[PDB]
Write a protein that binds this ligand. Structure first.
Ligand SMILES: CCOC(=O)c1cn(C)c(=O)cc1Cl
Length: 103
């Protein structure tokens, strides 16, 4: 239980983060040219929220994979000095930091 209880804590903390704005909702491929072709497994905080709420995470490890996928996607599609890339680096370092000072 404590495993999934922390997942809620961190997801909430990511959702409300200043740098979270690129990752709150699925990327809209109609608005982002090339996104469909380049990113095979899209992921975002609202998708993780839906699954978490509907109980669909077996372990804290499955949750971490989705979180890391968000930031791997970010780094694959965006330049590191792009506005989205900069936000993703802040978010990625925030996640790894929060996650580790518990596990
Ligand atoms: C809220 C709009 O965010 C974006 O436009 C965007 C988000 N992600 C996660 C990307 O990888 C690329 C863009 Cl353009």
């Amino acid at each position: 239980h404590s495993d999934l209880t922390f997942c809620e804590i961190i997801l909430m903390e990511m959702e409300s983060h200043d740098a979270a704005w690129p990752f709150l909702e699925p990327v809209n491929p109609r608005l982002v040219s090339g996104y469909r072709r380049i990113i095979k497994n899209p992921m975002d905080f609202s998708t993780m929220r839906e699954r978490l709420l509907r109980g669909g995470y077996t372990s804290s490890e499955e949750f971490a994979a989705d979180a890391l996928l968000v930031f791997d996607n970010c780094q694959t599609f965006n330049e590191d000095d792009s506005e989205v890339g900069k936000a993703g680096h802040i978010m990625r370092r925030f996640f790894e930091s929060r996650w580790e000072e518990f596990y």
